Amino acid sequence: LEELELDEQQRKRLEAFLTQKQKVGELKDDDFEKISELGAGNGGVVFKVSHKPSGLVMARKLIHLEIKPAIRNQIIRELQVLHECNSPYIVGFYGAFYSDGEISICMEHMDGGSLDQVLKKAGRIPEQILGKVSIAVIKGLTYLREKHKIMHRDVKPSNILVNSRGEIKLCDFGVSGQLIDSMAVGTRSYMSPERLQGYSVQSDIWSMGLSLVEMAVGRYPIPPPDAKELELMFGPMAIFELLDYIVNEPPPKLPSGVFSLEFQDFVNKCLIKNPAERADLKQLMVHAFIKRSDAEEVDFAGWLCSTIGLN
Numbered sequence: 593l594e595e596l597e598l599d600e601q602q603r604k605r606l607e608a609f610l611t612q613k614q615k616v617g618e619l620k621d622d623d624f625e626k627i628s629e630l631g632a633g634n635g636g637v638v639f640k641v642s643h644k645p646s647g648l649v650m651a652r653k654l655i656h657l658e659i660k661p662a663i664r665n666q667i668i669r670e671l672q673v674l675h676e677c678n679s680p681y682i683v684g685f686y687g688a689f690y691s692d693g694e695i696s697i698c699m700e701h702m703d704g705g706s707l708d709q710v711l712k713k714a715g716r717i718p719e720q721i722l723g724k725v726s727i728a729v730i731k732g733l734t735y736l737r738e739k740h741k742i743m744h745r746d747v748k749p750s751n752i753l754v755n756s757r758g759e760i761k762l763c764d765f766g767v768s769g770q771l772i773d774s775m776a777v778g779t780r781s782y783m784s785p786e787r788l789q790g791y792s793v794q795s796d797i798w799s800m801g802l803s804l805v806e807m808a809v810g811r812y813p814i815p816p817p818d819a820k821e822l823e824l825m826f827g828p829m830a831i832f833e834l835l836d837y838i839v840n841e842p843p844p845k846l847p848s849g850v851f852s853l854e855f856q857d858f859v860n861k862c863l864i865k866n867p868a869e870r871a872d873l874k875q876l877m878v879h880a881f882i883k884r885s886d887a888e889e890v891d892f893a894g895w896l897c898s899t900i901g902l903n
């Protein structure tokens with residue numbers, strides 16, 4: 593597929609990552625010194641750590657799990673598939689190990705944090721920036737589907753990471769069933785209405801469209817905002833009530849007058865409740881909003897650094 597091709601810069605960065613990764617070796621707990629806490633999420637705290645032997649800076653997620661030694665070795669073996677997932681739109685993976693009652697997952701460090709964290713800083717994210725985000729998520733989901741036959745299963749702003757180089761990558765896509773089972777939990781407020789009713793990449797496309805709306809307006813779009821909140825933005829529901837709303841009510845949408853019709857049509861085709869009518873990855877890759885965004889020269893790194901205060 594032409595959408596899986598890489599630039600010369602993307603190919604250079606991918607080779608540089610694998611070249612530095614070959615120098616690492618087997619990860620052990622005592623080889624890490626904590627630098628700072630990057631944040632909490634999905635049953636474990638993520639630390640910015642330094643791998644003392646190699647000197648690299650990594651993100652280390654520690655998941656406290658008390659399981660028999662066999663159960664742990666299965667999770668570690670199932671996470672080894674991440675070594676083969678190499679793409680400019682997938683967060684780089686270093687290794688996983690068990691130590692002192694905690695599963696560690698060491699990955700590439702993204703100094704921009706997640707888009708959940710960026711959204712809290714920005715308030716809302718502009719459409720041109722979200723065009724670059726849409727392109728990366730589509731290509732990331734396409735890479736996982738095409739080269740590995742893998743669904744993400746948990747697309748949301750907190751699982752989309754960015755950095756000061758202008759890169760946008762996905763992470764935390766389901767690869768180990770024994771890890772999800774042993775942790776039984778994550779939010780279901782981004783799941784498609786068909787998954788909430790009892791499973792395809794179409795579900796991930798719903799989650800992308802839902803995440804794009806939240807970042808565009810600056811709030812989780814369900815329940816829909818009233819006209820008073822709109823005039824304050826552009827000029828409580830329990831979780832079980834929220835999931836019932838997703839299944840039994842029409843999908844959310846962008847407000848009129850403030851976003852282009854191509855952007856509105858893009859999220860509309862992502863949020864069609866019928867997965868058969870909902871657009872797939874091939875159709876979205878050639879949507880008018882995506883083709884327009886790909887030709888737009890947007891300085892994402894410059895916008896990101898000034899928005900969150902990186903300097």
Ligand SMILES: CC(=O)N[C@H]1CC[C@H](Oc2cc(-c3ccncc3Cl)cc3[nH]nc(C)c23)CC1
Nearest residue numbers: 630631632633651653700701702706708750764
């Ligand atoms: C609500 C909210 O936004 N929570 C934040 C909390 C910090 C977290 O930060 C990372 C997490 C992971 C990661 C994800 C899955 N499994 C293993 C790991 Cl290591 C890799 C990372 N690389 N670089 C960074 C900065 C980073 C992102 C989500």
Ligand SMILES: [Ca+2]
Nearest residue numbers: 621622691692
């Ligand atoms: Ca330790």
Ligand SMILES: [Ca+2]
Nearest residue numbers: 621622691692
């Ligand atoms: Ca130790």
Ligand SMILES: [Ca+2]
Nearest residue numbers: 634746764778
């Ligand atoms: Ca998860």
